[PDB]
Design a protein around this ligand. Structure first.
Ligand SMILES: COc1ccccc1N1CCN(CC#N)CC1
Ligand SMILES: [Cl-]
Ligand SMILES: [Cl-]
Ligand SMILES: [Cl-]
Ligand SMILES: [Cl-]
Ligand SMILES: [Mn+2]
Length: 340
């Protein structure tokens, strides 16, 4: 039976099932006011699937110059062509190699660059922005988006959307690495999974993906989405309440000190965007600081809503294309105010 919603993370996470349901705001606003993230499934079924394929991005934009990051060591690969990223997205033998001769796990940095998404890709912009869930919150001019309505006393978000493209992490060693490290944003955001690429050549890599989800602390209902519905999992997220951000800074200052980093007592390890919380660090956060987060697996078509101020990290299970839009809800406007 088709239902309006379900309750994940032992009823700590709302999951809306109809992205265009005009009554979604009634369930949403109760969870959102408490500072929780929210998941909306099914956005892929609203989109023109031919506009979101890696082959189309290579053919249309392949000659542009870009930088890439090696996710395993943070090294920057300077001034290559964007086709050099897209042509290895699913075919492992076509990826750029590290010194050791391994194919690299790569992230495409800042592409499209700055605020150019709309100028470069007008048809993709229309397709995404017309099908975003909770449109009164998420549209540039929605009635509950204050982004265009605030004075300079508030940090306003840039013009979006922004695209996040990166390979999947592969090995047992890769379990401790982030695609995007732990950080926070002063605006609200919605992040849509528009394509998941499950490779070939070293296709048969299914088992390490299951142990990553398991050790990642994912709930039993999340595991049923793979085994029972055969949905495509893209990325594993950890998200923490905005109110827990300083306790996370105290843990990371203490670990930095144990590892012989030399840091002023006041430096900000969350703003540094230098840490990924592995199973050891997450257990320490829980046991020593009393902090519990949300472990979320974002499948093809899932929209993740991230509250302003909430620290969060992302680990790609397979190759992903994500598209994100910033907004300023009235519930969370305190997080972007420039005083006190
Ligand atoms: C999305 O979150 C859930 C949580 C708990 C149980 C099921 C789901 N869904 C409902 C059906 N949905 C589309 C279909 N068919 C995929 C799986
Ligand atoms: Cl809040
Ligand atoms: Cl376009
Ligand atoms: Cl709405
Ligand atoms: Cl990062
Ligand atoms: Mn972010």
């Amino acid at each position: 039976s088709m239902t309006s919603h379900s309750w994940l993370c032992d009823g700590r996470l709302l999951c809306l099932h109809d992205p265009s349901n005009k009554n979604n705001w009634k369930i949403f606003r109760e969870c959102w006011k408490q500072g929780q993230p929210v998941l909306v499934s099914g956005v892929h079924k609203k989109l023109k699937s031919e506009l979101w394929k890696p082959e189309a991005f290579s053919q249309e934009f392949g000659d542009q110059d870009v930088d890439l990051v090696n996710c395993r060591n943070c090294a920057i690969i300077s001034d290559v062509k964007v086709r050099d990223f897209w042509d290895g997205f699913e075919i492992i033998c076509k990826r750029l190699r590290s010194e050791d001769g391994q194919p690299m796990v790569l992230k495409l940095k800042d592409w499209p660059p700055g605020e150019d998404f709309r100028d470069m890709m007008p048809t993709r912009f229309e397709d995404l922005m017309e099908n975003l869930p909770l449109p009164e919150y998420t549209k540039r001019d929605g009635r509950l988006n204050l982004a265009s309505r605030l004075p300079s006393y508030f940090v306003r978000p840039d013009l979006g959307p922004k695209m996040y493209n990166a390979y999947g992490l592969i090995t047992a060693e890769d379990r401790r690495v982030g695609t995007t490290n732990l950080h926070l944003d002063v605006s609200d955001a919605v992040n849509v999974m528009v394509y998941v690429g499950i490779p070939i050549g070293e296709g048969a890599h299914d088992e390490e993906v299951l142990k990553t989800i398991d050790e990642g602390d994912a709930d039993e209902v999340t595991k049923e989405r793979i085994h029972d519905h055969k949905e495509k999992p893209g990325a594993l997220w950890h998200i923490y309440a905005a109110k827990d951000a300083e306790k996370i800074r105290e843990l990371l200052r203490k670990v930095g000190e144990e590892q012989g980093q030399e840091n002023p007592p006041d430096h900000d390890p969350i703003h540094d965007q230098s840490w990924y919380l592995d199973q050891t660090l997450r257990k320490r956060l829980y046991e020593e600081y009393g902090v519990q987060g949300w472990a979320i697996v974002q499948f093809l078509g899932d929209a993740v809503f991230i509250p302003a101020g909430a620290p969060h990290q992302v680990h790609n299970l397979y190759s992903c294309i994500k598209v994100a839009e910033d907004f300023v809800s009235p519930e969370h406007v305190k997080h972007c105010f420039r005083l006190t």
